[PDB]
Amino acid sequence: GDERFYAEHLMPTLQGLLDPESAHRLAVRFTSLGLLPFQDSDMLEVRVLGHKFRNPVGIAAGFDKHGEAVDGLYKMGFGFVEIGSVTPKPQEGNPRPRVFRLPEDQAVINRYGFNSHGLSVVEHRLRARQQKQAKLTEDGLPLGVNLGKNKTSVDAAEDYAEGVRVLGPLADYLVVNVSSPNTAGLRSLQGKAELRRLLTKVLQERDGLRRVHRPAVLVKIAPDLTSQDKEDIASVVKELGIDGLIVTNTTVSRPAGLQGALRSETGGLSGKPLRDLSTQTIREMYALTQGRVPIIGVGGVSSGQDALEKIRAGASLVQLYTALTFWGPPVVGKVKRELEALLKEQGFGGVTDAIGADHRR
Ligand SMILES: Cc1cc2nc3c(=O)[nH]c(=O)nc-3n(C[C@H](O)[C@H](O)[C@H](O)COP(=O)(O)O)c2cc1C
Ligand SMILES: C/C(O)=C(\C#N)C(=O)Nc1ccc(-c2ccccc2Cl)c(Cl)c1
Ligand SMILES: O=C(O)c1cc(=O)[nH]c(=O)[nH]1
C-alpha cells in the first residue's frame, strides 16, 4: 500500500516477469476482484456535466475497455470511471505485440486497434450493476462510456449512433472518440463538415433517449491537430451545443529525446512525453470555446502538479492511465494528495476556483 514499494519494486518486477499486454490483463483481473493496496476532501469536489464528482481524477479510456473493473476502479480512488472504447460488433484488434513500455521515458506506445467485446456484451455487463451505478453516480462517482467504430464499418456515424442507443441509457456521459491513431480514417472525422454531420446524428440519437437515461456527449480529440482543425472543432462544438471535450488522446508524434529502445514502434504515445502537448491543447481549446465548454484534461498526468497544470489551463476534470502502468494504484492517492496541497498553497478554495485560472492572469 506504499508508493515507494510499488514504484521501486512491485512494478519493475512485474515488468520483468510479464509482457505488457499480459500485465494489463492481470491488472484488470485484480482490479475487478478489488485486490488493491486517502480521504477525499470537500476541496476536490467538482460539479460539471450535470453531475457531482467527488474528486476530479478519473481513469482514462483504454484501461477498462470492456467495463469489467468499474467497481474496482472506484475502490482504487478514481472520482469517475470511463470505459471503452466500445465498438458495435466484437472485434479482435491488431496482432500482438501491440503495446510497449518505454520505462526510460515513463511512456507507453500502443496500437491495440479497438479490441472490443462489443456493445451487447458491455450492455449486459453494465445492466448487471445498473442500480449499484445509479447510487454511485448520486454519491458523486459518475460513469463515462467511450464509443468507437468497427474497423470494417462503412458508416462511421451509424456505428456511433448504435453506441448511443445501446450504452447511452447506462452512461452519465458518452465520448465520441474520433482520435484513436490506430483506426484508418478515424481522426479525419475531426474535420468540419464530417464532424458536424457526425455529431448532429449522435446528438439526435442522444436527445431521443428518456430523460433519466440521457447522457452528456463529449468529443475526444487528438493532440496532433492543426490550428485549423482546432478552430473548426471549437466552432462545431459551440454550434451544436456539444457538452464537453476530452483533451487529449495519444500522439502519433515522436518528440525529440525519447530514449526507449521501442520508441519507433507504430502507435500512439502516452505518458510523460505527451504531458505538455496535451496541456497546451487544453489551453487552446479552452480559449477557443471561451471557457464555456467543460474539458476533461488527459495526457501525462502522474502528479498533483501535472493535474493542477491541466486544471489551470482549462480542465474541469483530469484522467490518467499511463502513470498507473509505472507506479501502480498508489499513484491515484498521490495525485489527489498532491493536488489538494497545491490548491491550498496557491490560495484556491477548491478545484472549482482553479479551473482556467491561467486564462485570468
Ligand atoms: C494501452 C492504451 C490503450 C488506450 N485505449 C484507448 C481507447 O480505447 N479509447 C480512447 O479514447 N483512448 C484510449 N487510450 C488513450 C487514453 O485514454 C489517454 O487519452 C492517453 O493515454 C493519455 O493519457 P495518459 O498519458 O495518462 O496515458 C489508450 C491509451 C493506452 C495507453
Ligand atoms: C503495461 C502495464 O503494466 C499496464 C498497461 N496497460 C498496466 O495496467 N499495469 C498495471 C499492472 C498492475 C496494476 C495493479 C492492479 C491491481 C492491483 C495492483 C496492481 Cl500493481 C495496475 Cl493498476 C496496472
Ligand atoms: O488502439 C486503441 O485501441 C486505441 C489506442 C489509443 O491510444 N487511443 C485510442 O483511442 N484507441
**Minimal-distance CA residue to ligand 1 atom 9:** 85
As given in the structure block, the three cell numbers for residue 111 are: 496500437
d(CA 259, CA 40): 37
How far, in Å, from the CA of 357 to the mean position of ligand 3?
A: 31
How far, in Å, from the CA of 361 to the mean position of ligand 1?
A: 32
Q: Which of 300, 297, 303, 296 is nearest to 332 (CA)?
A: 303
Q: Is 61 annotated as a binding residue?
A: yes
| Bridge partners, 216 (sequence order) | 173
d(CA 26, CA 10): 14
DSSP β-ladder status, 268-271 and 46-48: unpaired
How far, in Å, from the CA of 127 to the mean position of ligand 2?
A: 26
As given in the structure block, the three cell numbers for residue 181 are: 491513431
DSSP β-ladder status, 99-102 and 107-110: antiparallel
Q: Is the shortest distance between the CB of 140 and ligand 3 below 6 Å?
A: no
Which CATH homologous superfamily contains domain 1-361? Aldolase class I (3.20.20.70)
d(CA 13, CA 10): 5
Ligand 3: atom nearest CA of 148 is 10
At how many Å resolution was this determined?
1.8
After which residues does the chain become discontinuous at a C–N distance over 2.5 Å? 37
Active site members: 180
| Bridge partners, 58 (sequence order) | 80, 319
Q: Compute the C-alpha angle 48/46/359, nearest 5°.
A: 80
Q: How far is CA 136 from the centre of its chain?
A: 19
Experimental method: X-ray
Q: Is 286 annotated as a binding residue?
A: no
Sequence-distant (≥ 6) Cβ neighbours of residue 98 within 8 angstroms: 21, 110, 111, 112, 113, 267
d(CA 321, CA 303): 12
How far, in Å, from the CA of 65 to the mean position of ligand 3?
A: 10
Q: Is the shortest distance between the CB of 298 and ligand 1 below 6 Å?
A: yes
d(CA 233, CA 158): 20
Pocket of ligand 2 (CB under 6 A): 10, 14, 20, 23-24, 27, 30-31, 35-36, 99, 101, 324-325, 328-329
Peptide bond into 179 cis (omega under 30): no
Q: Is the shortest distance between the CB of 268 and ligand 3 below 6 Å?
A: yes
Ligand 2: atom nearest CA of 108 is 1
Q: Is the shortest distance between the CB of 177 and ligand 3 below 6 Å?
A: yes
Q: Is the shortest distance between the CB of 182 and ligand 3 below 6 Å?
A: yes
317 φ/ψ angles, rounded to the nearest 5 degrees:
-140, 160
Q: Are 252 and 224 in contact (CB under 8 A)?
A: yes
In SS3 terms, the chain reads as CCHHHHHHHHHHHHHHHCCHHHHHHHHHHHHHCCCCCCCCCHHHCEEECCEEECCCEEECCCCCCCCCCHHHHHHHCCCEEEEEEECCCCECCCCCCCEEEEHHHCEEEECCCCCECCHHHHHHHHHCCHHHHHHHHHCCCCEEEEECCCCCCCCHHHHHHHHHHHHHHHCCEEEEECCCCCCCCHHHHHCHHHHHHHHHHHHHHHHCCCHHHCCEEEEEECCCCCHHHHHHHHHHHHHHCCCEEEECCCECCCCCCCCCCCCCCCCEEEEHHHHHHHHHHHHHHHHHCCCCCCEEEECCCCCHHHHHHHHHHCCCEEEECHHHHHHCCHHHHHHHHHHHHHHHHCCCCCHHHHCCHHHHC
d(CA 84, CA 31): 16
As given in the structure block, the three cell numbers for residue 351 are: 478545484
Q: Is 55 annotated as a binding residue?
A: no
b/e code 26-59 from CB counts within 10 Å (16+ = b): ebbeebbeeebeeebbebbbbebbebbbbbbbbb
Q: Are 171 and 134 in contact (CB under 8 A)?
A: no
Instruction: Considering every ligand atom shown, identify the ligand nearest to the alpha carbon of residue 84 and give its number.
Output: 1
d(CA 201, CA 204): 5
137 φ/ψ angles, rounded to the nearest 5 degrees:
-55, -50
Sequence-distant (≥ 6) Cβ neighbours of residue 269 within 8 angstroms: 107, 108, 109, 250, 251, 252, 253, 254, 255, 258
Q: Is 188 annotated as a binding residue?
A: no
Q: Is 85 annotated as a binding residue?
A: yes
How far, in Å, from the CA of 268 to the mean position of ligand 1?
A: 8
Q: Is the shortest distance between the CB of 108 and ligand 1 below 6 Å?
A: yes
| Bridge partners, 308 (sequence order) | none
Q: Are 116 and 38 in contact (CB under 8 A)?
A: no
Instruction: Considering every ligand atom shown, identify the ligand nearest to the alpha carbon of residue 102 and give its number.
Output: 2
Q: Compute the C-alpha angle 204/148/162, nearest 5°.
A: 40
Question: Given CA atoms 166, 169, 175, 178 in this order, what sign does their dihedral have?
Answer: positive
